[PDB]
Design a protein around this ligand. Structure first.
Ligand SMILES: CC(C)(C)c1cccc(CN[C@H]2C[S@@](=O)C[C@@H](Cc3cc(F)c(N)c(OC(C(F)(F)F)C(F)(F)F)c3)[C@@H]2O)c1
Length: 377
């Protein structure tokens, strides 16, 4: 029954992927950002310059006030509001209705994005990181508890104005090619995984693998970039600089500030290396790798001048909260959040990114000793 959910995601580049939902009785329609990096379901519930519509609790006969406040600080942006519950549906999702916790957003700072076309956020990670605390049941937990929808979902985020699929309750085999490879969810709070090796253009970075997961590695559809811990970021940039030294770049480009352009159609893709992340596998001493093409970490942005060149921003950036595998890693992969079996699956997406002589890949098996030592404590 998954064909009804194919292509149920939309978005604008760098502004996230959202799915249509309805809340309340009668149903109020809102676009909701899908975010595996948080665990709160929250919606605009009051006028805001960037909102063209919002949730109106007074108009819903099924609304219940929980008479308790709440706020959530993200990396950038935050909101506060009122907790309550209401009936929620996903039109292009499973044919069910659930009563879910909803944070009605009454105030916010840099949360909503001008022109993003979404009015709320769907936190799909675990109760452990819910605000105010882990007793506030996340939406997907409610869905699974109240219905017969199996305890997993999958995301196919496609690049170029963007679209994708959130298959709720299963895996749609027409969305990927090749085999699915699975890495354990290390702990159910964020979708935390363990990176055991990193290579750039086939060359091992040769760092202590704990550095890759310091202080954690997570899969986060609410983040645009691949984000890397300071030491790893510097090693990666040094290596990517070396490989592309043929050309000169503004150092503000490597900081993700200045975009670089080339004459439309002449982007020197070949001088930018592929990046391979090796993830812990399902059996002893076994891992697998996902390989990212430059077409994924050089994100296309519109011309800041009058010309019609191809311009790009460097979409790898430094993190102080661990590795974040954001949308640009997830794009061109089919990612399965298999909560029931505590694992995340990766396969080459059907909407995979193209290079002339190179291809994004998910490959295994590999042997990797002492993978347990890669986890940071
Ligand atoms: C407390 C809590 C929630 C567990 C937490 C605190 C810090 C870091 C994290 C890890 N996950 C975070 C990383 S943060 O960069 C984005 C956040 C979700 C989010 C909040 C926002 F305000 C906005 N605008 C947003 O839109 C982005 C973008 F436009 F790129 F900003 C777009 F559009 F790309 F999606 C996305 C996600 O959840 C969780």
């Amino acid at each position: 029954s998954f064909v009804e959910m194919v292509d149920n995601l939309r978005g604008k580049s760098g502004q996230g992927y959202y799915v249509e939902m309805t809340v309340g009785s009668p149903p109020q329609t809102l676009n909701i950002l899908v975010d595996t990096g948080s665990s709160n379901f929250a919606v605009g519930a009051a006028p805001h310059p960037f909102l063209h519509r919002y949730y109106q609790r007074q108009l819903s006969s099924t609304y219940r006030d929980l008479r308790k406040g709440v706020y959530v600080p993200y990396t950038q942006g935050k909101w506060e509001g009122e907790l309550g519950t209401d009936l929620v549906s996903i039109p292009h999702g499973p044919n069910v209705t659930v009563r879910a916790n909803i944070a009605a957003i009454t105030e916010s700072d840099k949360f909503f994005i001008n022109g993003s076309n979404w009015e709320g956020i769907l936190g799909l990670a675990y109760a452990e990181i819910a605000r105010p605390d882990d007793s506030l049941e996340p939406f997907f937990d409610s869905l699974v508890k109240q219905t017969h929808v199996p305890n997993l979902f999958s995301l196919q985020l496609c690049g170029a104005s963007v679209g994708g699929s959130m298959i709720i309750g299963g895996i749609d085999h027409s969305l990927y090619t090749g085999s699915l490879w699975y890495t354990p969810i290390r702990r159910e709070w964020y979708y935390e995984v363990i990176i055991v090796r990193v290579e750039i253009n086939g060359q091992d970075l040769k760092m202590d693998c704990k550095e890759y997961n310091y202080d954690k590695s997570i899969v986060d559809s609410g983040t645009t970039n691949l984000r890397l811990p300071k030491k790893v970021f510097e090693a990666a940039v040094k290596s990517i600089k070396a490989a592309s030294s043929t050309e000169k770049f503004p150092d503000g480009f490597w900081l993700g500030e200045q975009l670089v352009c080339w004459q439309a159609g002449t982007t020197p893709w070949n001088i930018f290396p592929v990046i391979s992340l090796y993830l812990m596998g399902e059996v002893t001493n076994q891992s697998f790798r996902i390989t990212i093409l430059p077409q994924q970490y050089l994100r296309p942005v519109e011309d800041v001048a009058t010309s019609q060149d191809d311009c790009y921003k460097f979409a790898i950036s430094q993190s102080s909260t661990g590795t974040v595998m954001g949308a640009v890693i997830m794009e061109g992969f089919y990612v399965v959040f298999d909560r029931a079996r505590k694992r995340i699956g990766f396969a080459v997406s059907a909407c995979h990114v193209h290079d002339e002589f190179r291809t994004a890949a998910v490959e295994g098996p590999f042997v990797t000793l002492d993978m347990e030592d890669c986890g940071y404590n």
